Design a protein around this motif. Structure first.
Motif, PDB file in Angstrom:
ATOM      1  N   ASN F 280      46.831  40.982  52.020  1.00  0.00           N
ATOM      2  CA  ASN F 280      48.076  41.202  51.125  1.00  0.00           C
ATOM      3  C   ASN F 280      49.338  41.607  51.969  1.00  0.00           C
ATOM      4  O   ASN F 280      50.376  41.122  51.941  1.00  0.00           O
ATOM      5  CB  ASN F 280      47.927  42.491  50.275  1.00  0.00           C
ATOM      6  CG  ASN F 280      46.840  42.123  48.943  1.00  0.00           C
ATOM      7  OD1 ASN F 280      46.319  40.906  48.862  1.00  0.00           O
ATOM      8  ND2 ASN F 280      46.784  42.945  48.087  1.00  0.00           N
ATOM      9  N   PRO F 310      38.442  38.794  37.184  1.00  0.00           N
ATOM     10  CA  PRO F 310      38.518  37.008  36.993  1.00  0.00           C
ATOM     11  C   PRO F 310      38.597  36.349  38.480  1.00  0.00           C
ATOM     12  O   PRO F 310      39.432  37.004  39.134  1.00  0.00           O
ATOM     13  CB  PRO F 310      40.014  36.988  36.072  1.00  0.00           C
ATOM     14  CG  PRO F 310      40.697  38.223  36.764  1.00  0.00           C
ATOM     15  CD  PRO F 310      39.817  39.155  36.781  1.00  0.00           C
ATOM     16  N   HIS F 311      38.235  35.326  38.497  1.00  0.00           N
ATOM     17  CA  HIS F 311      38.020  34.187  39.556  1.00  0.00           C
ATOM     18  C   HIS F 311      37.513  34.810  40.823  1.00  0.00           C
ATOM     19  O   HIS F 311      37.479  34.392  41.889  1.00  0.00           O
ATOM     20  CB  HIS F 311      39.448  33.634  39.905  1.00  0.00           C
ATOM     21  CG  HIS F 311      39.468  32.285  40.272  1.00  0.00           C
ATOM     22  ND1 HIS F 311      39.164  31.240  39.346  1.00  0.00           N
ATOM     23  CD2 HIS F 311      39.763  31.640  41.269  1.00  0.00           C
ATOM     24  CE1 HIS F 311      39.067  30.125  40.100  1.00  0.00           C
ATOM     25  NE2 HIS F 311      39.700  30.350  41.240  1.00  0.00           N
ATOM     26  N   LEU F 315      43.572  41.505  41.323  1.00  0.00           N
ATOM     27  CA  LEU F 315      44.517  40.774  40.577  1.00  0.00           C
ATOM     28  C   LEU F 315      45.804  40.490  41.472  1.00  0.00           C
ATOM     29  O   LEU F 315      46.756  39.645  41.502  1.00  0.00           O
ATOM     30  CB  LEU F 315      44.913  41.613  39.441  1.00  0.00           C
ATOM     31  CG  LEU F 315      43.951  41.592  38.370  1.00  0.00           C
ATOM     32  CD1 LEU F 315      44.387  42.126  36.740  1.00  0.00           C
ATOM     33  CD2 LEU F 315      43.566  40.019  38.023  1.00  0.00           C
ATOM     34  N   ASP F 316      46.108  41.662  42.396  1.00  0.00           N
ATOM     35  CA  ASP F 316      47.363  41.455  43.109  1.00  0.00           C
ATOM     36  C   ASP F 316      47.391  40.476  44.124  1.00  0.00           C
ATOM     37  O   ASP F 316      48.262  39.651  44.272  1.00  0.00           O
ATOM     38  CB  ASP F 316      47.775  42.708  43.980  1.00  0.00           C
ATOM     39  CG  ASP F 316      46.099  43.455  44.394  1.00  0.00           C
ATOM     40  OD1 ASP F 316      44.962  42.540  44.349  1.00  0.00           O
ATOM     41  OD2 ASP F 316      46.048  44.599  44.964  1.00  0.00           O
ATOM     42  N   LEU F 318      45.887  37.579  43.376  1.00  0.00           N
ATOM     43  CA  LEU F 318      46.315  36.489  42.833  1.00  0.00           C
ATOM     44  C   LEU F 318      47.711  36.214  42.543  1.00  0.00           C
ATOM     45  O   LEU F 318      48.334  35.195  42.436  1.00  0.00           O
ATOM     46  CB  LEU F 318      45.435  36.375  41.250  1.00  0.00           C
ATOM     47  CG  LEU F 318      43.915  36.161  41.638  1.00  0.00           C
ATOM     48  CD1 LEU F 318      43.338  36.298  40.045  1.00  0.00           C
ATOM     49  CD2 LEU F 318      43.595  34.954  42.290  1.00  0.00           C
ATOM     50  N   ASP F 319      48.550  37.271  42.075  1.00  0.00           N
ATOM     51  CA  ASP F 319      49.814  37.341  42.017  1.00  0.00           C
ATOM     52  C   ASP F 319      50.649  36.908  43.271  1.00  0.00           C
ATOM     53  O   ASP F 319      51.443  36.277  43.352  1.00  0.00           O
ATOM     54  CB  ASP F 319      50.325  38.806  41.597  1.00  0.00           C
ATOM     55  CG  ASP F 319      50.108  39.197  40.142  1.00  0.00           C
ATOM     56  OD1 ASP F 319      50.319  38.344  39.378  1.00  0.00           O
ATOM     57  OD2 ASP F 319      49.957  40.530  40.153  1.00  0.00           O
ATOM     58  N   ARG F 320      50.022  37.138  44.389  1.00  0.00           N
ATOM     59  CA  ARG F 320      50.618  36.776  45.639  1.00  0.00           C
ATOM     60  C   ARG F 320      50.221  35.271  45.823  1.00  0.00           C
ATOM     61  O   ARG F 320      50.771  34.665  46.951  1.00  0.00           O
ATOM     62  CB  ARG F 320      49.858  37.637  46.862  1.00  0.00           C
ATOM     63  CG  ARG F 320      50.727  38.808  47.675  1.00  0.00           C
ATOM     64  CD  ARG F 320      50.585  40.000  46.906  1.00  0.00           C
ATOM     65  NE  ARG F 320      50.945  41.091  47.714  1.00  0.00           N
ATOM     66  CZ  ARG F 320      51.146  42.415  47.236  1.00  0.00           C
ATOM     67  NH1 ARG F 320      50.822  42.797  46.109  1.00  0.00           N
ATOM     68  NH2 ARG F 320      51.674  43.168  48.202  1.00  0.00           N
ATOM     69  N   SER F 321      49.638  34.664  45.223  1.00  0.00           N
ATOM     70  CA  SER F 321      49.029  33.324  45.389  1.00  0.00           C
ATOM     71  C   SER F 321      49.304  32.462  44.329  1.00  0.00           C
ATOM     72  O   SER F 321      49.821  32.857  43.169  1.00  0.00           O
ATOM     73  CB  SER F 321      47.573  33.296  45.850  1.00  0.00           C
ATOM     74  OG  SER F 321      46.738  33.771  44.499  1.00  0.00           O
ATOM     75  N   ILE F 322      49.274  30.963  44.546  1.00  0.00           N
ATOM     76  CA  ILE F 322      49.535  30.015  43.554  1.00  0.00           C
ATOM     77  C   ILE F 322      48.115  29.187  43.242  1.00  0.00           C
ATOM     78  O   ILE F 322      47.595  28.894  44.273  1.00  0.00           O
ATOM     79  CB  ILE F 322      50.816  29.369  44.089  1.00  0.00           C
ATOM     80  CG1 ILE F 322      52.036  30.001  44.178  1.00  0.00           C
ATOM     81  CG2 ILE F 322      50.964  27.951  42.871  1.00  0.00           C
ATOM     82  CD1 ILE F 322      52.897  29.129  45.070  1.00  0.00           C
ATOM     83  N   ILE F 323      47.962  29.211  42.197  1.00  0.00           N
ATOM     84  CA  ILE F 323      46.492  28.482  41.868  1.00  0.00           C
ATOM     85  C   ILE F 323      46.598  26.955  41.453  1.00  0.00           C
ATOM     86  O   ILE F 323      47.780  26.646  40.776  1.00  0.00           O
ATOM     87  CB  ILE F 323      45.957  29.174  40.720  1.00  0.00           C
ATOM     88  CG1 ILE F 323      46.202  30.787  40.820  1.00  0.00           C
ATOM     89  CG2 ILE F 323      44.449  29.051  40.423  1.00  0.00           C
ATOM     90  CD1 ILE F 323      46.083  31.633  39.622  1.00  0.00           C
TER      91      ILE F 323
END
Ligand SMILES: Nc1ncnc2c1ncn2[C@@H]1O[C@H](COP(=O)(O)OP(=O)(O)O)[C@@H](O)[C@H]1O
Ligand SMILES: Nc1ncnc2c1ncn2[C@@H]1O[C@H](COP(=O)(O)OP(=O)(O)O)[C@@H](O)[C@H]1O
Ligand SMILES: Nc1ncnc2c1ncn2[C@@H]1O[C@H](COP(=O)(O)OP(=O)(O)O)[C@@H](O)[C@H]1O
Ligand SMILES: Nc1ncnc2c1ncn2[C@@H]1O[C@H](COP(=O)(O)OP(=O)(O)O)[C@@H](O)[C@H]1O
Ligand SMILES: [Mg+2]
Ligand SMILES: [Mg+2]
Ligand SMILES: [Mg+2]
Ligand SMILES: [Mg+2]
Lengths: 49, 447, 442, 97, 443, 430
Positions: F280, F310-311, F315-316, F318-323
């Motif tokens: 992060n 999830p996944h 969560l943070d 995932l917010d920092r990333s693009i899926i």
């Protein structure tokens, strides 16, 4: 070689200022050090000046 | 003043407020209240200063922000220098390199100090000139050299071994040297001032000293203050003196420890070395392994066991390494061989006096109503929460460039920085925004 | 003059082959316990058994460690004795089994006695003795070397074989210097110039030693002792000045390593060979372990295996717990935390709590040891307090009463001083009650 | 020169060089014993086990890369070390047994 | 050209002389109270009086916590040391976590050193040993002194050197025609190289050539290099001197962290205090920043209490986002922000509020301007709406592929079709979770 | 060169795209996944741009559905001279290095630095070399003659190069190269080669070095050895700060340029929570290569924590990333992929055999068929017919089991196999 660009402009030896004292015990004793601190040749340069 | 003068949490307190009758004054030596605790601390200090008793454990008890650490710091200050005082935290002993038991052993050995005296017979003086008949006879023809002091000067006769030793570390006269009477060791102290103008660039070892004054040879005694742990570390390794600074002691075996104990006892019997009992302080001992507690219980019954004082703000809770909960966070066997000192929460008058002394310590003047508001806030909040507010309010007043701190500045500082209860309330009111224990969190404001 | 919860125990307090007295050697009560301890002392002094394990169990502050200290004192300084803690074995550097084996070997000792014939004294003169060579030749032949020795209250001259020439040339000793010569081994060792020659020079780098006292010929017997673990570590650890391994020991960190069994058995073999000649004398020791309830089950198993060795010494274990679970196993419940198989291999010695009169006697004896005097009323109050809270609390409270009396310039403690101590200093029960009655997280 | 001399003076041994040897100094005399034949240090064990070592040493490092030893020790024709210092190092390695 | 990574658009807190934060300044919008508090903290740090004071700032994700922690450092200036840290980095294999925390604590505070040195430099014209004819009995054969002449552009000068410097320069293997360097303080001699005047002496030459130095011969100068105390401790623990073979072997070995004793730190403190009393040095307190402090163990939290009460303890700031959680390494202790209550009592709490839709739109506009991209008003409004719908960071990250999508069609403006295509090609967390709910094999 | 027998991703080379970033239905061994391919091309163009750094992109999809293939194609299309680090998640768990330190080293390994140095050198066939000992007239006289196709002249040796030439045996008539600045000798072979022209020429040498290599070199007396032995051991942070500052000065001076490569982490789902927390922060600094991740699992328990996320990621992060999501392959895509794999392995498949193989792959899995293709060939040359028939495929299918068939058989015969509780039966009777 590229990283050895001149550092003496912004470097300090750090041993002339007695900040590496950890190796002084290898050759110096306590009483000799005390005597050499007491027997400084100061006040003679002042007289010559 | 020799240490770094940066203002810390415990700076105002100096020594103990006790008198010759061990009666604590209400406000003295930078401490307020806790008369019973201060008297107990003075009793313990006198116990340590007596030095005839060892292997005693004393506990300090109290809620957070009551003065336990302050009391320990004051005890150390009153003890003064020349007496060892080791202050470590509970979590510090957990080391990857060293076992916890060995760490405790080293901490115990550090807290006990030793004074050793040594006598030397040295002949120090500037040499006038050295003459050796290398051609008249050759091969140590018993040369002679003259040594001069500011008050006296004589001529000495030199043997073959003298010449052989002096060939190494060549001396060209006009230099101040010291010779050893026992082993005949040649030591070059420094050159004379007359050689200062010989060149324009000197060597690294080149130095100038004045001529020594007084008798040619003198008998002097030197006293060294070295604690035991240094002695064990030095004896353990061929070059153990580096291990002190580096810290990689290497789990010294007990055989060296008992040899050192025997040597120390022999020196004490001969009178060369005297033992100076010290104080070992362990802070936040509420956290520790049970093995450490058992080792402490066993090791408290040794002759070289310094007085141990511990502090804990925990109630009846679980002890690390065990599932069950023990009173005071410590096993009962340790509590058996210990004395517990309890500290009570301060009063409003005590709180305001402490705040005034803290403000005076930080060279900060306060308005009377500002002090009253700060005391009122610190009654509901904690005492420790008020000092940071005081510093922030002083900074705000300096920003406004208006002398003393005003009530408005204190109110603004309180508005800017929140208390723990207010933060808890705000978090609870907005629990969706923060990350929950299950990892679930809501980011988007829109629904 | 420092005391720490001990040093008032002087032996087991027994008598000449009988039941121990009521009060002796700083011991009061528990006659059966110290009688059994004396029996164990006799057994180890027999020096015939191997791997004999005993265990003492009882309540806290019942003299469990005091009895071990007493047997250690009774055995004597010459007999090795290694105190240990249950938490000692957990070592980061090496596995626990190796540490336990090392402690076991350190428990066993060994004594060496040697006699030497010494001819020492000032060198009066060195004169070779000429004789005809057995084989025809024009070279000089020497049959003996004459050396004169001078000492305090006696001087003598010795005729020796001419092979001493190499040693006398090596030692660089000429005239008027004290030397040492062994009778049968030969050779010579310079020890320093005679003190009479000190004034011959204004300065000197060489010390001058006084002439030996007594006759030039001396017969002194020397005794040296060392434990087996020291022999093992000396055998394993390299020594030397300039060999590569010598400063490979340098620039690195020497750490404990698992010593192989072949080195230990070689040391045992050479020790047996030397002891068969009568020069050596093996003396088993005693290993003392406290809080044995804290040992791991694996360490317990290794102890079970090791106690059957032919060199394992006598070990003594102490535990203050009862029906508990052995560490490392959540379901196994055995008395004192020792697994049942290990308990089957040793003997259990009980310990009983003291009475009010015994507590008072202990307090008064401790007060006599601490060099302070109490009154009868104060002593009775202290005994009642000890019977109420605990014995150890009363024992610890002694020094604060002395300090308080010193502050009041009094020489003897009174009821007021002990009351001041009781209000200033708390015990476990009052602290627990305060914790229960307070909600400030204290 | 005055400043240099004044600054070069307060060089204190942290503890001592005489304290070290005074604490090494063991009052116990030489007291020679059979411990010389009892210790048998590592070098002696290496020396007297010549036959076993000769008979039971077989395997060789089948893959080797020469001139890697000098590079690993940091001494070679070109490096960051001084020529005289490296020459002294190889001399010492030559004369060390 | 210029790189941007979720930052570099913040030049500072952006506060006026009265401490009131402007609505938009230095890449920041809103959070006036937080900016004012950070400015107060900056003033306290610059006061150089308090030691060990600690603050903690808390809030939801993407509330600007890291942005504020970087803006405070930017406002402080490069001179004052600032060591960023993450709670996970403390756990080190080589040494215990407490040693690492203490090392970082000592790294935080800095110190500047001033010393004067004089240097003789220039091309070597000639060198001449002088041997005294008098044996004097004390020596067999030695040179009384050595005379060396130095040449540079401004002039030439001759020098008289004692045998030690002569031995050093002889070891340096310098003949006539080489530019050398003499240090008066330590007597250090180093060969810079051969002067370029002899370049044409041979057709080829291994030696490099150096131009003749400026300055007459001898120069006076001082160095104001600033070094933190941790470097002093490391140098004291790891000396670099000595020509011994053992020293070279030690130099070859990798530097392993070790628990530096408190005695060494005490001696360093003593000598530093002596020097600062002499006025030859000045001590400058620094700032230590730790991110995601919830990752810390309870042992480190406990040791922080002891560390913060030290004399030389700097100002340390902490960042956290969790709420009611259990401290790591414990069983049931539930504390706000995952920090034990005593530590919370010791520090100060700063709150960060979320952002409004208009604030999000302004943030997107500022970020896009920083990235040097053109966005249509309608496309920007759509981006603001979808960012408010899912997250601000999603929109900030989606700002980048829209530029590539526009470039592919050769247009220079962000169009609604482009952002729609990007949304089709890239899914946020909520869509991924929703499609993960109904799938065959973990999707 | 670059020896390799056969890889599961050997067939795919360079992904496939057009000037408008429109994926072709089949281009350079890539089939299907049009949206995923376009997103990968967008990411590749982002990397080649270099203006934006420190962004996270995630790849998600069912197992054996174009996940590692996408990363391999992206790396191949990115080409050489651009850093690309591909490490499994479990690799960072090192006994001698902290996980944070290993992650930092991986991050630094993905940013490459190009440095240019200009050197002068001479080369050509050498025909004459003469060397003389010291005389009072001259300390050392040495003449050598180097002849090229265009030139042949004599240089004068001033002592040092005489020693260098005498250090190693040199014989006339062989091609050598002499670097005047460095003073080293390089032998290019014997006269096998031919000269070209002027002896002395102007050229520059460019070196590509990562930040991690620079840190390791500057961290020790001989740091470049740790580049291979892997004993770097927790490089100090001030070293990295100093390296960053020096790199900034070099870039502003034009002496060097940076190449923001790509860091690819596979099986991120099993990384610890501390690693995610460190990532992060590490993704928000100045020097940060692009980061792409691929996790097969979905809605599972994050390692190091009790709760399920999830996944498999916090969560943070995932917010920092693009899926980026991949879809399951279809039969017409499966048959084309199998044909491409057979072409890569040089296997001839009959139409009916190919159809049966496609049906089996649809029924069970694509990997099963892509493994059966090779094993059927062994039976093929066992029957001595080059083409693979339906009989060989059926024989391979019955000989080597599938996951479903093995599971069903285990369920039927659980008595013979060892149970979870440890119960098992070996005896047949009773
Ligand atoms: N007698 C006293 N006089 C003045 N201040 C005190 C006194 N006792 C405690 N304090 C204050 O309390 C603080 C220390 O609290 P401490 O005892 O460390 O809390 P805890 O009990 O959690 O360890 C210090 O900042 C100090 O200013
Ligand atoms: N017979 C005795 N005479 C005097 N003191 C005794 C006697 N028995 C026990 N003690 C006291 O009990 C203490 C020993 O406690 P101990 O029972 O070993 O603790 P634990 O039960 O934890 O092992 C000693 O300090 C000693 O003063
Ligand atoms: N007030 C603000 N103005 C401009 N950008 C902001 C603001 N608040 C947050 N950001 C942006 O949000 C991004 C990440 O926020 P960050 O502080 O890392 O989240 P967290 O608080 O969870 O650590 C940063 O790159 C920053 O540019
Ligand atoms: N578009 C494609 N073209 C050709 N082969 C592919 C394609 N997608 C996947 N594959 C095959 O799938 C395999 C990679 O499986 P992958 O989807 O990476 O597994 P996972 O999803 O578990 O990472 C490769 O061996 C490759 O042959
Ligand atoms: Mg405290
Ligand atoms: Mg006991
Ligand atoms: Mg964040
Ligand atoms: Mg795959």
């Amino acid at each position: 070689k590229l990283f050895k660009k001149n550092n003496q402009v912004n470097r300090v030896d750090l041993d002339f200022l007695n900040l590496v004292f950890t190796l002084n015990d290898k050759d110096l004793t306590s009483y000799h050090a005390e005597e050499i601190s007491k027997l400084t040749c100061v006040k003679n340069f002042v007289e010559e000046v | 003043l020799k240490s770094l003068s940066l203002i810390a949490a415990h700076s105002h307190i100096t020594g103990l407020g006790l008198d010759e009758n061990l009666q604590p004054r209400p406000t003295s030596e930078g401490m307020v209240g806790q008369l019973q605790a201060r008297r107990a601390a003075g009793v313990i200090l006198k116990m340590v200063q007596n030095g005839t008793i060892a292997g005693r454990a004393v506990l300090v008890a109290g809620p957070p922000s009551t003065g336990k650490t302050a009391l320990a710091m004051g005890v150390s200050q009153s003890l003064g220098k020349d007496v060892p005082f080791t202050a470590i935290a509970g979590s510090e002993i957990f080391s990857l390199e060293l076992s916890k038991t060995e760490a405790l052993t080293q901490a115990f050995r550090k807290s006990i100090g030793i004074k050793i005296k040594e006598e030397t017979e040295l002949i120090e003086g500037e040499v006038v000139e050295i003459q050796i008949d290398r051609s008249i006879t050759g091969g140590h023809k018993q040369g002679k050299l003259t040594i001069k002091t500011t008050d006296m000067e004589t001529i000495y006769e030199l043997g073959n071994k003298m010449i052989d030793g002096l060939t190494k570390e060549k001396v060209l006269a006009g230099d101040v040297i010291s010779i050893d009477k026992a082993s005949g060791k040649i030591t070059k102290l420094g050159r004379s001032f007359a050689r200062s103008r010989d060149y324009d660039a000197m060597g690294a070892d080149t130095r100038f000293v004045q001529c020594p004054e007084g008798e040619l040879q003198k008998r002097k005694t030197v006293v060294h203050t070295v604690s035991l742990h240094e002695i064990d570390v030095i004896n353990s390794r061929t070059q153990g003196f580096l291990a002190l600074f580096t810290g990689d002691t290497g789990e010294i075996r007990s055989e060296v420890r008992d040899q050192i104990n025997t040597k120390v006892a022999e020196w004490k019997e001969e009178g060369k070395a005297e033992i100076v009992p010290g104080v070992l302080f362990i802070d936040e001992v509420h956290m520790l392994d049970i093995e450490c507690f058992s080792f402490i219980n066993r090791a408290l019954e040794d002759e070289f066991a310094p007085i141990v004082m511990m502090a804990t703000n925990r109630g009846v809770s679980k002890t690390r390494g065990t599932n069950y909960k023990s009173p005071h966070g410590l096993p009962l066997d340790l509590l058996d061989r210990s004395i517990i000192i309890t500290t009570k929460s301060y009063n409003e008058q005590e709180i305001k006096t402490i705040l005034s002394i803290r403000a005076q310590e930080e060279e900060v003047e306060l308005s009377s109503d500002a002090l009253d508001l700060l005391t009122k806030t610190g009654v509901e909040t904690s005492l420790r929460y008020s000092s940071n507010l005081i510093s922030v309010a002083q900074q705000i007043a300096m920003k406004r460039k208006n002398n003393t701190v005003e009530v408005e500045d204190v109110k603004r500082a309180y508005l800017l920085f929140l208390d723990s209860a207010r933060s808890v309330k705000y978090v609870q009111e907005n629990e969706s925004q923060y990350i929950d224990d299950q990892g679930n969190v809501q980011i988007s404001i829109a629904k | 003059t420092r005391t720490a919860a001990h040093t008032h125990i002087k032996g087991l307090g027994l008598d000449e082959s009988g039941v121990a007295k009521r009060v002796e050697g700083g011991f009061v009560g528990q006659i059966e316990a110290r009688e059994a301890c004396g029996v164990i002392v006799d057994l180890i002094k027999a020096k015939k058994m191997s791997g004999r394990a005993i265990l003492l169990a009882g309540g806290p502050s019942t003299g469990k460690t005091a009895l071990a200290l007493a047997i250690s004192q009774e055995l004597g300084p010459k007999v090795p004795f290694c105190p240990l803690v249950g938490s000692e074995l957990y070592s980061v550097e090496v596995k626990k089994t190796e540490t336990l084996m090392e402690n076991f070997r350190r428990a066993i000792g060994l004594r060496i006695k040697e006699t030497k014939e010494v001819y020492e004294g000032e060198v009066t003169e060195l004169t070779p003795e000429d004789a005809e060579n057995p084989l025809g030749g024009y070279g000089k032949t020497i049959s003996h070397v004459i050396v004169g020795l001078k000492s305090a209250k006696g001087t003598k001259t010795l005729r020796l074989d001419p092979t001493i020439y190499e040693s006398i040339q090596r030692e660089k000793v000429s005239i008027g210097d004290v030397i040492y010569i062994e009778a049968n081994t030969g050779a010579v060792k310079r020890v320093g110039r005679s003190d009479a020659y000190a004034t011959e020079f204004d300065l000197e780098t060489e010390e001058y030693v006084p002439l030996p006292k007594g006759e030039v010929h001396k017969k002194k017997e020397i005794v040296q002792d060392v434990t087996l673990h020291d022999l093992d570590v000396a055998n394993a650890r390299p020594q030397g000045g300039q060999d590569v391994i010598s400063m490979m020991g340098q620039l690195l960190k020497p750490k404990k390593t698992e010593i192989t069994e072949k080195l230990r058995q070689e040391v045992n073999k050479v020790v047996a060979k030397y002891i068969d000649q009568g020069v050596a004398e093996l003396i088993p020791g005693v290993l003392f372990i406290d809080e044995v309830n804290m040992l791991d089950i694996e360490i317990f198993t290794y102890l079970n295996k090791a106690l059957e060795s032919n060199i394992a010494p006598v070990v003594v274990l102490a535990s203050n717990r009862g029906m508990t679970t052995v560490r490392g196993t959540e379901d196994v419940i055995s008395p004192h935390g020792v697994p049942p198989d290990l308990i089957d291999r040793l003997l259990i010695v009980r310990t009983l709590p003291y009475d009010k009169d015994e507590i008072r006697t202990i307090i008064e004896r401790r007060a006599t040891v601490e060099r302070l005097q109490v009154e009868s009323s104060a002593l009775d109050l202290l005994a009642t307090m000890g019977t109420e809270t605990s014995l150890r609390y009363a024992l610890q409270l002694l020094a604060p009463c002395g300090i308080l009396a010193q502050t009041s310039n009094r020489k003897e403690i009174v009821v007021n001083d002990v009351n001041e101590a009781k209000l200033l200093f708390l015990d476990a029960k009052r602290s627990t009650k305060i914790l229960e009655t307070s909600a400030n997280y204290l | 020169v005055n400043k240099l001399r004044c600054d070069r003076r307060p060089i204190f041994g942290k503890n001592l060089i005489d304290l070290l040897t005074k604490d090494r100094r063991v009052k116990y005399d030489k007291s020679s014993i059979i411990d010389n034949e009892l210790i048998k240090p590592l070098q002696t064990r290496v020396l007297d086990n010549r036959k076993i070592i000769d008979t039971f040493a077989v395997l060789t490092p089948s893959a080797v890369s020469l001139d890697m030893r000098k590079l690993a020790l940091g001494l070679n024709d070109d490096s960051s070390v001084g020529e005289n210092t490296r020459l002294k190092v190889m001399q010492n390695c030559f004369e060390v047994s």
